[PDB]
Amino acid sequence: RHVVICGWSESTLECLRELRGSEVFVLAEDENVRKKVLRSGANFVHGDPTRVSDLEKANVRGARAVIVDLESDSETIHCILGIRKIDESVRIIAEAERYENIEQLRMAGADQVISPFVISGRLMSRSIDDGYEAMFVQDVLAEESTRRMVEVPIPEGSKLEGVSVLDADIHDVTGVIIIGVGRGDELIIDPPRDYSFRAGDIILGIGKPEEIERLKNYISA
């Protein structure tokens, strides 16, 4: 139960924020960050996120998870090869750049890629006539709104346990847009109204925090 980011980013300052769990460790070369990382509670460790020795000094060993935010795409792969050389077990999340790599990135031992490159390229390609698309993404995702995505754990013998998505009627009862259901690590985006909820599932929906609360209550034991 401890988290490790390795590599600095203009979105670590942000990463580091809503990430205040038991322990957060940061590995970077650029000593310049020293002040910033600490000035946010979390822990700084100075070194090369590709050197094995260093990842170990970064307590990669046993980590709740490890996040790899690096300039180069090859650097990422290396780091990962070095990461699981220590832990065939830790969760790996990596931010990626090229598409051609994503696969390789994963084969290398990565669990989640992210490719915000590929994201932007399309958004803009798509946002020629109107940024309506962009706006949404800009809001739920770029944080410009309070409307956010959520995940909501269906708890042991909830009221919604054993209930069709039609019957559930989450949006009309609560006002959050149900968009997909997680179960045992496969998201079934846009689930059919004949899908029973199984206690242990995870509702991925989108909305505001009343809306989300209301959800939480509705699907409570």
Next chain:
Amino acid sequence: RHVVICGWSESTLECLRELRGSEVFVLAEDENVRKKVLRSGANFVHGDPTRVSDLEKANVRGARAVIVDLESDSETIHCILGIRKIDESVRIIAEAERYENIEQLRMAGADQVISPFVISGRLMSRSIDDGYEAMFVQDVLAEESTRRMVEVPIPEGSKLEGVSVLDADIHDVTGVIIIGVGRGDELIIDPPRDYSFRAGDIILGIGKPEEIERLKNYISA
């Protein structure tokens, strides 16, 4: 009716793809790209996307729109200052990095920012326990799926014209998740079931292309 990107990116190769309109012009310093841009039909112009002279040689004048994909964040601002020095009229879309800048970026003359930085940082912060969130984004957005976002123009005196969102019941009829409505450049994410559709509105929803077709047909004149 002509589009101009200025600046190269691993997501221009992708940008350039689904962007094959009347004319696409690309401005960059790195001559290395020459072959690639052309090997995709579009037009290459060699120069500095901050030099006024150059943007003009890049036909920034009169553009259907201009997309600014640049390494530095200051470079972007400059470019934009230089862009509208030629056209207080063109559409500006810019990919951004820092949050602190977004505002300034816009004040500078930008219409849509994009900040895929800030996006990733959160995703991963959020995708510690499960990438369920990430998966979705990875799919509709990172292009890993065929489930995509859409915009759908409500046409003159459609069947849905003058009809409540409740009554519409888009998802149950067509199977696409209605998530927000564009009208005169303000997206009303998650619209209330008491919202009448006004012919000229734009449905922002998410799904597969049958689903989308079906939508198109349903809201046809």
